Amino acid sequence: MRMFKITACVPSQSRIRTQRELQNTYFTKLVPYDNWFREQQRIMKMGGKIVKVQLATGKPGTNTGL
Amino acid sequence: PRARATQPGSLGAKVFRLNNELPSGKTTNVSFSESATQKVIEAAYRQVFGRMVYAGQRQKVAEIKLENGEITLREFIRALAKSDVFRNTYWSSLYVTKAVEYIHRRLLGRPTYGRQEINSYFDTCAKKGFYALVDAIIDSKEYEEAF
Amino acid sequence: SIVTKSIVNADAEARYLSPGELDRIKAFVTSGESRLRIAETLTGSRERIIKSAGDALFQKRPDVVSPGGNAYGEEMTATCLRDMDYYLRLITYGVVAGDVTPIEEIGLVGVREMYKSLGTPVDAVAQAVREMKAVATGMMSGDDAAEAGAYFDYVIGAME
Amino acid sequence: SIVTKSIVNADAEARYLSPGELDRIKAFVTSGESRLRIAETLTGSRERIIKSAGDALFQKRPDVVSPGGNAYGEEMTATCLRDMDYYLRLITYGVVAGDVTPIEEIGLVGVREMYKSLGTPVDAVAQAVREMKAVATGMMSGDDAAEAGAYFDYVIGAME
Amino acid sequence: SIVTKSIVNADAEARYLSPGELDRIKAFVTSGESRLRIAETLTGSRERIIKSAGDALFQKRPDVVSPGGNAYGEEMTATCLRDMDYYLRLITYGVVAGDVTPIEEIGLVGVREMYKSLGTPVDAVAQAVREMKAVATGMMSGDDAAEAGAYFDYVIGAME
Amino acid sequence: SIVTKSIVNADAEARYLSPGELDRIKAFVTSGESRLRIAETLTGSRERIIKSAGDALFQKRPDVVSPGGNAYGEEMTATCLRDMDYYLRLITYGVVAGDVTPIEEIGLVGVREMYKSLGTPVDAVAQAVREMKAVATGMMSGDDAAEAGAYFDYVIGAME
Amino acid sequence: SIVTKSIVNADAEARYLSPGELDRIKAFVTSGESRLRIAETLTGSRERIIKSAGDALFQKRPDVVSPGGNAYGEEMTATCLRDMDYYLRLITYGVVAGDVTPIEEIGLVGVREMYKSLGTPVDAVAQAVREMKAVATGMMSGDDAAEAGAYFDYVIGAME
Amino acid sequence: MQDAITSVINSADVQGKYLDGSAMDKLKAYFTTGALRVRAASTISANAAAIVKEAVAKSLLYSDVTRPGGNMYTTRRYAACIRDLDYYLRYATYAMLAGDPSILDERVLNGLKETYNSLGVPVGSTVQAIQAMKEVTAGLVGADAGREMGVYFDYICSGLS
Amino acid sequence: MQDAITSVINSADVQGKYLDGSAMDKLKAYFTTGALRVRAASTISANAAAIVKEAVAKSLLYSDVTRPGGNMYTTRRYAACIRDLDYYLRYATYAMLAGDPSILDERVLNGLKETYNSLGVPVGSTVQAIQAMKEVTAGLVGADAGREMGVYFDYICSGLS
Amino acid sequence: MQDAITSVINSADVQGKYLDGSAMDKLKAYFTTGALRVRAASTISANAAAIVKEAVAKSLLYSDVTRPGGNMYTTRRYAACIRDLDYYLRYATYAMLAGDPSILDERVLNGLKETYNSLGVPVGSTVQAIQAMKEVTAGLVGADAGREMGVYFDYICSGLS
Amino acid sequence: MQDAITSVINSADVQGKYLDGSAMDKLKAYFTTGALRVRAASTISANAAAIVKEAVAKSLLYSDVTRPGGNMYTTRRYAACIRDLDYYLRYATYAMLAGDPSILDERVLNGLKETYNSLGVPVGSTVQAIQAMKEVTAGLVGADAGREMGVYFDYICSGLS
Numbered sequence A: 001m002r003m004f005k006i007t008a009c010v011p012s013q014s015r016i017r018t019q020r021e022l023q024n025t026y027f028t029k030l031v032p033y034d035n036w037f038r039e040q041q042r043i044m045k046m047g048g049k050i051v052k053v054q055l056a057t058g059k060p061g062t063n064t065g066l
Numbered sequence B: 001p002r003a004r005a006t007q008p009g010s011l012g013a014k015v016f017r018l019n020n021e022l023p024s025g026k027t028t029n030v031s032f033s034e035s036a037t038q039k040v041i042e043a044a045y046r047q048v049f050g051r052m053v054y055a056g057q058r059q060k061v062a063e064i065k066l067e068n069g070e071i072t073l074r075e076f077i078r079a080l081a082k083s084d085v086f087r088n089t090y091w092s093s094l095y096v097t098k099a100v101e102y103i104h105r106r107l108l109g110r111p112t113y114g115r116q117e118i119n120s121y122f123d124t125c126a127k128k129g130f131y132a133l134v135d136a137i138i139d140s141k142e143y144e145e146a147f
Numbered sequence C, D, E, F, G: 001s002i003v004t005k006s007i008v009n010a011d012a013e014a015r016y017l018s019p020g021e022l023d024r025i026k027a028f029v030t031s032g033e034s035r036l037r038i039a040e041t042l043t044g045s046r047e048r049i050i051k052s053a054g055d056a057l058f059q060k061r062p063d064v065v066s067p068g069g070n071a072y073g074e075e076m077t078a079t080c081l082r083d084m085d086y087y088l089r090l091i092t093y094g095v096v097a098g099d100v101t102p103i104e105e106i107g108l109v110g111v112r113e114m115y116k117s118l119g120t121p122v123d124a125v126a127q128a129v130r131e132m133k134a135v136a137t138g139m140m141s142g143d144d145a146a147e148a149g150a151y152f153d154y155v156i157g158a159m160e
Numbered sequence H, I, J, K: 001m002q003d004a005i006t007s008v009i010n011s012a013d014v015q016g017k018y019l020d021g022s023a024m025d026k027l028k029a030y031f032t033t034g035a036l037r038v039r040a041a042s043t044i045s046a047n048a049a050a051i052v053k054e055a056v057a058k059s060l061l062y063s064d065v066t067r068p069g070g071n072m073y074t075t076r077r078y079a080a081c082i083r084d085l086d087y088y089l090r091y092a093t094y095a096m097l098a099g100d101p102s103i104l105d106e107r108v109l110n111g112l113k114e115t116y117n118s119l120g121v122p123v124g125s126t127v128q129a130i131q132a133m134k135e136v137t138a139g140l141v142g143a144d145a146g147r148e149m150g151v152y153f154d155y156i157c158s159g160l161s
C-alpha cells in the first residue's frame, strides 16, 4: 500500500478562532502514497513545515505488487 | 468568502468537530473520550450515507484507524465515501450527472454552482472514474476552507 | 457524572460553564443525599432483587433455561445471575453519578456484539433488566422509584 | 451475478473489462450447465430438505419450539419452515447466479435488524441453515456438494 | 495475479473471500499449465516475433523511420525494438499472472506522459503492439491465441 | 478580455473594481489603438504568413507530410494549413482582446484530446505555430513583434 | 507585495500567471519610482506628521488624555505616539509594497483583541490614523496623496 | 442494473415461484451466448479510440457541425463530443455483456435528452454518429456480435430520439 | 475526562470492588469542596478578561516579548498570546470544577510542548504569565479556591516545563 | 501486497532476468498447493465465528483478563478483543491464500506493536489466543493446511512479540 | 513567502525602523532586475516542456536509472521523475521572479530530503539533472537571467544535498 507516516505541523496564519485546535496545528498521521503529493501540497499551501516523513509500510525498489 | 469557515449558530445545522483527538494509553473505564469519538463517527456515517447504515455494512477498519488516531476525519470521510456500499447505493443506481450532483451535495454540503464546476468534475469522472470524483471533491479548496 | 458531561460540553463549545449548568451542578450537589439513599437501598437488597427478578424472567421467558438454550445448567444460570449483578451494579453507579455515562462506558458499548458472540439473546437480557426495574421500583418510594426507573429505563432502551 | 460484478468493477475504474475478467465470465458461462444441474437438484427435493432440516433443527435446538420460544405453536412453526424455505430459495438463486449478490441483496442485509425486531435468536437460524446444508450436501455428488456448500457457507457466515 | 486482486476486493469490501472467487482461484490454479505453455512459446520465439512485427510496423507507418521522425538511425530503431521487447515481456508476465495488473504496474501508468516527453507517437506504439499481437496469435493455437490476444488487446486498448 | 477578467476577479471577491484594476483597464483602453494596428498587420498578410509558415514547417518536420504522417496528401495538407489559419485567427483575437481568454477559451482547452483523437503529433503543431511566430515577428516593428509574440508564446506554451 | 499575492492566486487556482497580472507586475515595476518618492517624503517628515496629528487627535477626542482615560500621563501619551509611529511605519511599508498585505501581517490581525486587553478605545486609534491621513495627504501632491490615502483609508477601514 | 440472469431471477421472485423450465431455457440461452459476448467485448476494448474516430470520420467530420456555428466547433466541444461517443460505446459494451439494456436507461438515457436539449446539442447528428459507430463495430466483430451490439446501439438511439 | 467522582468510580472499577466507605469519604470530600468550587467558578467566569489583562500587564508587558525582538511582537502573535492565556485560564477553571487535572493532561498538555518547541515560544515567559495569573485569581476569588486554582496552574506549568 | 506469483515475478524483476525454469518450478509448487488452499479457505470462511469462540473459550475465558482487573473486562474491551481475533483469523486466511506473509507484515503488524504497548494490551494472552486459534483451525481444516495456517499464525506472533 | 520587497520590509520591520535610503537602493536594484526577470519568466513558461525533455535527454536517459535496475525504470517512476523535474523548474521560476529563495526553502526543500531518503531516490542523479536543466535554461533565456536561474537551481541542489 506504501502508506506514509507524516508528523507534519500546520500553521495559524490568520482568522484567529476561539476553538482549541491542537489537533490541526500539530499532528502525526498516515496517508496513502498515491495522494501523498496532494496532501503534501496542502501542507505547503498552508505554510507549515513538516517534521518527519517515514514509510509505514511497503518497500522501496518494488516494481510490482506495490 | 472569508466566512466560509464560520459555523452557523441556531439558524443552521450543528457542526461536529473531532477536536479532542481521543488520546489514551492506559485509558479509564469511565473515560468520556471514546463516547464522544463514537458520536463523531455516528455523525460522519449519517452525513455521508444520509442514514445510519445497516449493521453488516459499516466499515470497522476505518472506525478503528480513526479511534487509534492515524487518519484524520477528512481521510475517514474519504474512506467512507470510496466504499462499496456508498457507490452501490448512490453512484451505481443513478445517472452519472445526477450522481455527480448528489455526491457533491453529500460531501460538500451544497449543490453545484454552474456548468464549469460540473464539466470539471464529470471530466474527472470521465478520464479516471468515481474514485477520482470523490478524491477531487475532497481535494477542493472549498472543502479545506469550509471543514 | 454531570460535571464531566458539562465540562466536555463547555469544552466542545469552547466557552466557560453557563450559570444554568452551574445551577445544575449545584442542584446535583444538593440532591446528593437523595441519590445516596437510593443507592444505599439498592446495595442493601441486591440479592432479593436478583432472585425475584431471575425467577420472574425464567417464568416469563423459558427459552433461555430450556435445553438447547443459552442459560442451561447450574453454571450457566449462575452466570446469568452474575450478569444481572453487573447490570444492577452499573445501575447503582449511574444512580450515584447523576448521569448514565458510567453505565455507558462500562456496560453499554458493545453488548450487542459480545452477546452475538456468546449466543445470548439480548432481548432476554432486556426482559431481565425489566424485571429488575419492576422489583426495585416496587421496593422504593415512588419518587425515588421514578429516579431509579429512569436509569433502568435507559438501560432497557439501550438494550432493545 | 458474476457479469454484474465484473461490469460494475470495471465501471467504477473507467475502463473496459480486463481480459482476466473476460475469461472469468467465460468460465462461469461454461460452468452454468453444472450450476443449473445443482439448481434442479436443490429445487426438486425442497420438501425433504425443509422437512428433515426442520426436524434436525428442533431436535438440536428444542427451546425455540418449547413454550417461551419464538417458533412455538402451529402457525409459528409453519412460519419458521417458511423462513427456511425462503433461505433455500435464495440458495438456489445464488447457485444459478454464480455469486452471492442475489442472496445478500435480497435476504441478508438487514437480517439482524429484522430478526431482532421479531424477537428471534439468530444463532438458531444459523443452525437451521446448517441443517439445511447437511441435508443438501448429503443429497449430491462431491463437487456439487462443495459448490452448493459454498453458498450455504456464505449464508451461515452472514448470519454470524 | 488474480489472488492479489481478489484479496484487495475482499479487503475493500471488508469480508472474506466468496466461494465464487475461491472457485476462481482454484480454476486459475488448474489452468496454470496452459498459461505456462503460452508463456513458454512466447519466451521461445520472442526474436522472430519482434523482427517480423517491427518490419511490419515500419512497412505500415514509415513516419517513425523517416528523417525528422522519432526512430531515425540505428540506435533509435534498436531502442524501438527494445521497447517492443519490454512490452512483449510484460505481455508474458501478465499471461502467466492471469491478470493485467503487473502490466499496469510496470508499463501502463505514465506511458502517455513519458512518450509526450520523449516525442514518441503513442499510436505508433499501439500499432507496434498490434503487429506483435497479430504475429504471436499467428504462432499460437487458436484457444491459446485468444488468451494471449486478450492481454495484447488490453495493452493496445490502454495505449490508444 | 482584460475587462472580463477584472470584473470576474472583483466579482468573486464581492467587491468593486480596485483603482489599480481600473488604471489597468484604462491603460488597455489607451493601448487599444496599437492593438488594432497589430491586428491589421496580422490580418492583411495572412496569406504569406500561412504559406511561408507551412513551407518552413514541412521543411523542418518532413515526416508528417511523408506517407505515414497525418498531413499526407492534398486534402490533408489543406486541412493542416486550415488548422494553422484557425490558430492565426485566434492569435488576432487575443491581440485585440488584450488577454488570452479568447485563445484559451476557444482553441486551447481540449487541444490535446482532439489532436490525440485525430492522431496528430502536437509537437509538430507547436513547430507550426513557431514558424508562424517567426514569419509574423519578421513582419512588424520591435514592440509590435514583442506584443504579438507574447500571444504566439502563449499558444506554443499551451501546446506543451 | 503584489507579486506574492499574484503568486498565491495562481497557486490556489493551480495555473500559471495570466498575462493580465504579468502586465500588473510590470506596471508595478515601472511605478516603483513614484512609490519610492511617496515613501521617501513620508519617511522624511514623520515627526511633524505625528506631532500635528497627535495634537489634532487630542483636540478632537479629549477622553483619552483625560484622567481615567487610556493615554493619561507622560509615558502613556508617549506610547500613544509610539503606536502612531508604528502605524505610519506600516503605512510606508504598504506604500512601498504596492499591497496592503504587510500592514495586514504586522499590524491588523488582532488589534481589536489586544486593544480590548489594554483598554485602548479602537475608534480613537481610527481617529488618530484619520488625522495622520489628513496631514500626510496635506503634505503630498494630489496624485501621490491619493495613493497614500488609499493605504491610510484601508487602515482606518480595518480599524472601525 | 441487472443482467439476463438477475432479470430472470427477479421475474421468478416477483412471481414467488421456483425456476421452471422456461427460466432454465432462458439461462441456457445466455450461457451459450456468453462466450461470444466475452470475445466481442475484448475486441471492442481493443479498438475504442479507433471506432470512435472512424465514427466521427464517417459522420461528423467535414460537415457544418465542425464548421463555425456548429455545436461541435471548438476544441472544448470536440473533446466533449469524443467523450460522449466514448461513453456510448462503453455503455453499449456493458449492455452487450449483461445481455440486458437496463444499464442504458439507468445510467445513459436517464437525463440525457433534457441535458442535450438544455445545452443545444443536436440529437439527430449524435444519433447518426452512434449509428456510424454501430456500423463500424459491426464491421469489426462480425455479423451476429455486430447485431447484438446494434440492438443496444438502437436502444440508445431510440431513447435519445 | 474524569471527575473526582469518575476517578473514584474508575479506581474502584479496575480492582473490581463495589463502593467502599473510603470511596464515600472521598465523594463527600468532593461535594463539600464542590459548593465553593461552583462559586469560585462563577467569579472566574465573570472576571476572566480582567484576570488575563492583569496577568499580561503584570509580567509580559514591559519586557522584550511585547517589545520588538520577542515572540509577542506583532499583533498576530499578541492575539495568539492572549488566546493562549485565555485557554489556560478556562481549562484551569474546568480542572477546578472537576476536581481532577486529567483534563489538563488530556486536552492542554497533549501536544503543547512540541508545538511550543517548534514555533519557538519561550516556556519561561509563559510560566511567569501563568503564575501571575494564578495569584491574580487567588486575590480575586479567595484563599482556599486560590489554592485550588494554584495546584491546577502548577499542573499546567509542570506539564509545560 | 504480493502473492507467491507476484514475489516470483518481483524477484526475477529486480535482478532483471526473464522467467527461468526454477521460477516455473515455484509457480507449479504454488498451484498444486493452491487448490487445497482454496478448499481450506472456504472451510475457514464457513466456520470463522465458531473458530474464534472456541479460541477464546480455550484460552482467555476463565483467566484474569475476561475477569475484572484484566484488559478484557468491559463489554467494550470484550468486543474489541473479539474483533482483534476475527481480524487475525481473516488476515491469516488471506496470507494462506496468497502464499506469502507480506500482507501480515503490510497491514497487520505495521503499527500494531506500538498501539498494543500504548493501550496496555497484554502480548502474551494475545499470542496464547492466536495459538489456540491455530490448532482449532488445524483440527478443523486438516493437517497440511493446518501447517499452512500455522506458519502464518506464527508470523503474526513473531511480528507481535 | 517573501519577495525582495517583502524581505526588505521584513528586515526594516524586525529592527523597527522606517524605510532608509539603503532599502530604496535594494528596491531599485530589484526593479531594474525585475524587468528582465519578467521576460525570462515568459520565455521559460513558453518552453518548459522542451527544457525538461532536454534535461532528461542530457543526463538521465542512457544511464542505469532510465534502464532497468534504476529508480527511473517503470513508467510510474518515469512519470514521477518528469513531474519532479517540472516542479523544480517551476519553483525555480517562482524564485527567479520573487528575487528570493525563501519559496524554495518553504515549499520545495521542506520535507523533500527525508522522502528522498525513504523512497530511495538517488540524490546525485537528481542534482545532475537539475544542473543540466540549469545550463539548458541558461542557453535558452540568456546570460544574466541564466545566472539568476543558476543561483536558484544551486539553492535547490544545496538544500537537496
Ligand SMILES: CCC1=C(C)/C(=C/C2=NC(=C\c3[nH]c(/C=C4\NC(=O)[C@H](C)[C@H]4CC)c(C)c3CCC(=O)O)/C(CCC(=O)O)=C2C)NC1=O
Pocket: A011, A012, A019, A020, A021, A022, A023, A025, I065, I071, I072, I076, I077, I078, I080, I081, I082, I084, I085, I087, I088, I091, I107, I108, I109, I112, I115, I119, I121, I122, I123, I125, I126, I129
Ligand atoms: C486547549 C489547549 C491548547 C493550547 C494552549 C494551544 C496553543 C497554541 N498556541 C499557539 C501559538 C502561540 N502561543 C504563543 C504564546 C505566548 N506568547 C508568548 O510569547 C508567551 C510565552 C505566551 C503568552 C502567554 C504565541 C506567541 C503563539 C504564536 C506564535 C506564532 O506561531 O506566530 C498555537 C499555534 C496556532 C496559533 O497561532 O494559535 C497553538 C495551537 N492550543 C490548544 O489546543
Ligand SMILES: CCC1=C(C)/C(=C/C2=NC(=C\c3[nH]c(/C=C4\NC(=O)[C@H](C)[C@H]4CC)c(C)c3CCC(=O)O)/C(CCC(=O)O)=C2C)NC1=O
Pocket: C064, C065, C070, C071, C072, C076, C077, C079, C080, C081, C083, C084, C086, C087, C090, C106, C107, C111, C118, C120, C121, C124, C125, C128, J061, J066, J067, J073, J074, J075
Ligand atoms: C458490566 C458490563 C459487563 C457485562 C454485560 C458482562 C457480561 C458477561 N457475560 C458472560 C457470560 C454469560 N452471560 C449469560 C447471560 C444470559 N444468558 C441467558 O440465558 C440470560 C437470559 C442472560 C442473563 C441476563 C450466560 C448464559 C453466560 C455464559 C455464556 C457461556 O458460558 O457460554 C461473561 C463471561 C464470563 C466472565 O468472564 O465473567 C461476561 C464477561 N461482563 C461485564 O463486565
Ligand SMILES: CCC1=C(C)/C(=C/C2=NC(=C\c3[nH]c(/C=C4\NC(=O)[C@H](C)[C@H]4CC)c(C)c3CCC(=O)O)/C(CCC(=O)O)=C2C)NC1=O
Pocket: D064, D069, D070, D071, D072, D076, D077, D079, D080, D081, D083, D084, D086, D087, D090, D106, D107, D118, D120, D121, D124, D125, D128
Ligand atoms: C427472503 C428473505 C426473507 C426472510 C428471512 C423473511 C423473514 C420473516 N420472518 C417472519 C417471521 C418468523 N420467522 C420465524 C423463524 C424462526 N424462528 C425460529 O425460532 C427459527 C430459528 C426460525 C426459522 C427456522 C418465526 C418464529 C417468525 C414469527 C415471528 C412472530 O410471529 O413474532 C416475518 C414476519 C411475518 C411474515 O410476513 O412472514 C418475515 C417478513 N422475510 C423475507 O423476505
Ligand SMILES: CCC1=C(C)/C(=C/C2=NC(=C\c3[nH]c(/C=C4\NC(=O)[C@H](C)[C@H]4CC)c(C)c3CCC(=O)O)/C(CCC(=O)O)=C2C)NC1=O
Pocket: E064, E065, E070, E071, E072, E076, E077, E079, E080, E081, E083, E084, E086, E087, E090, E106, E107, E111, E118, E120, E121, E124, E125, E128, K061, K062, K063, K065, K066, K067, K068, K073, K074, K075
Ligand atoms: C516496461 C515499461 C517500459 C517502457 C514502455 C519503457 C520505454 C523507454 N523507451 C525509451 C526510448 C525509446 N523508445 C523509442 C520507441 C519508439 N519510437 C518509435 O519510433 C517507435 C514507433 C516506438 C517503438 C514502439 C525510441 C525511438 C526511443 C529513443 C528515444 C530517444 O532516444 O530520444 C527509453 C530510454 C532508454 C532507456 O533508459 O532504456 C525508455 C526507458 N521503458 C520501460 O521500462
Ligand SMILES: CCC1=C(C)/C(=C/C2=NC(=C\c3[nH]c(/C=C4\NC(=O)[C@H](C)[C@H]4CC)c(C)c3CCC(=O)O)/C(CCC(=O)O)=C2C)NC1=O
Pocket: F064, F069, F070, F071, F072, F076, F077, F079, F080, F081, F083, F084, F086, F087, F090, F106, F107, F118, F120, F121, F124, F125, F128, H061, H062, H063, H066, H067, H073, H074, H075, H078
Ligand atoms: C479554432 C480551434 C480549432 C482547431 C485547432 C481545430 C482543428 C481540427 N483539425 C482537424 C483536422 C486536421 N488538422 C491537421 C493538422 C495538422 N497535422 C499536421 O501534421 C500538422 C502538424 C498540423 C497542422 C499544421 C490534419 C492533418 C487534420 C486531418 C486529420 C485527419 O484527417 O484524420 C479537424 C477535423 C476536420 C474538420 O472538421 O476540420 C478539426 C475540428 N478545430 C478548431 O475549431
Ligand SMILES: CCC1=C(C)/C(=C/C2=NC(=C\c3[nH]c(/C=C4\NC(=O)[C@H](C)[C@H]4CC)c(C)c3CCC(=O)O)/C(CCC(=O)O)=C2C)NC1=O
Pocket: G064, G065, G070, G071, G072, G076, G077, G079, G080, G081, G083, G084, G086, G087, G090, G106, G107, G111, G118, G120, G121, G124, G125, G128, I061, I062, I066, I067, I068, I073, I074, I075
Ligand atoms: C506594528 C503593529 C503594532 C501595534 C498596533 C502595537 C501596539 C502596542 N501599543 C502599546 C501600548 C499603548 N498604546 C496606547 C495607545 C493609545 N491609547 C490612547 O490613549 C490613544 C488613543 C491610542 C494611540 C493611538 C497606550 C496608551 C499604550 C500604553 C497602554 C498601557 O501602558 O496600559 C504596546 C505596549 C508597549 C510595547 O511593548 O511597545 C504595544 C505593543 N505594537 C505593534 O507592534
Ligand SMILES: CCC1=C(C)/C(=C/C2=NC(=C\c3[nH]c(/C=C4\NC(=O)[C@H](C)[C@H]4CC)c(C)c3CCC(=O)O)/C(CCC(=O)O)=C2C)NC1=O
Pocket: B096, B097, B118, B119, B120, B122, H060, H065, H070, H071, H072, H073, H076, H077, H078, H080, H081, H082, H084, H085, H087, H107, H108, H112, H115, H119, H121, H122, H125, H126, H129
Ligand atoms: C454518461 C452519460 C452522459 C452523457 C452522454 C453526457 C453528455 C454531455 N455532453 C455535453 C456536451 C457536448 N456534447 C457534444 C456532442 C455533440 N455535439 C455535436 O455536435 C455532435 C453531434 C455530438 C457528438 C457526437 C458537444 C459538442 C458538447 C459541448 C457543448 C458546448 O461546449 O457548448 C455536456 C455538457 C457539459 C460538458 O461538456 O462537459 C454533457 C453533460 N453527460 C453524461 O453524464
Ligand SMILES: CCC1=C(C)/C(=C/C2=NC(=C\c3[nH]c(/C=C4\NC(=O)[C@H](C)[C@H]4CC)c(C)c3CCC(=O)O)/C(CCC(=O)O)=C2C)NC1=O
Pocket: B027, B064, B065, B067, B068, J065, J071, J072, J076, J077, J078, J080, J081, J082, J084, J085, J087, J088, J091, J107, J108, J109, J112, J115, J119, J121, J122, J123, J125, J126, J129
Ligand atoms: C488489520 C490489522 C489490525 C489489528 C489487529 C488492529 C487492532 C486494534 N486493536 C485495538 C484494541 C484492543 N485489542 C484488544 C485485544 C485483546 N484482548 C485482550 O486482552 C487480548 C490480549 C486480545 C484479545 C485476543 C483489546 C482489549 C483492545 C481495546 C483496549 C482499549 O482500547 O480499551 C485497537 C484500538 C481501537 C479499538 O478499540 O479497536 C486497534 C486499532 N487494528 C488493525 O488495523
Ligand SMILES: CCC1=C(C)/C(=C/C2=NC(=C\c3[nH]c(/C=C4\NC(=O)[C@H](C)[C@H]4CC)c(C)c3CCC(=O)O)/C(CCC(=O)O)=C2C)NC1=O
Pocket: A033, A036, A037, A040, A041, A044, K065, K071, K072, K076, K077, K078, K080, K081, K082, K084, K085, K087, K088, K091, K107, K108, K109, K112, K115, K119, K121, K122, K123, K125, K126, K129
Ligand atoms: C513542490 C516541491 C515538491 C517536490 C519536488 C515533490 C517530490 C516528490 N517526488 C516523489 C517521487 C519521485 N521522485 C523521483 C525522482 C527522480 N527520478 C529519478 O530517479 C531522479 C533521481 C529524479 C528525476 C529527476 C522518482 C523516481 C519518484 C518516485 C519513486 C517511487 O515512489 O516509486 C514523491 C512521492 C509521490 C510521487 O510518486 O510523486 C513526492 C511527494 N513533492 C513536492 O511537493
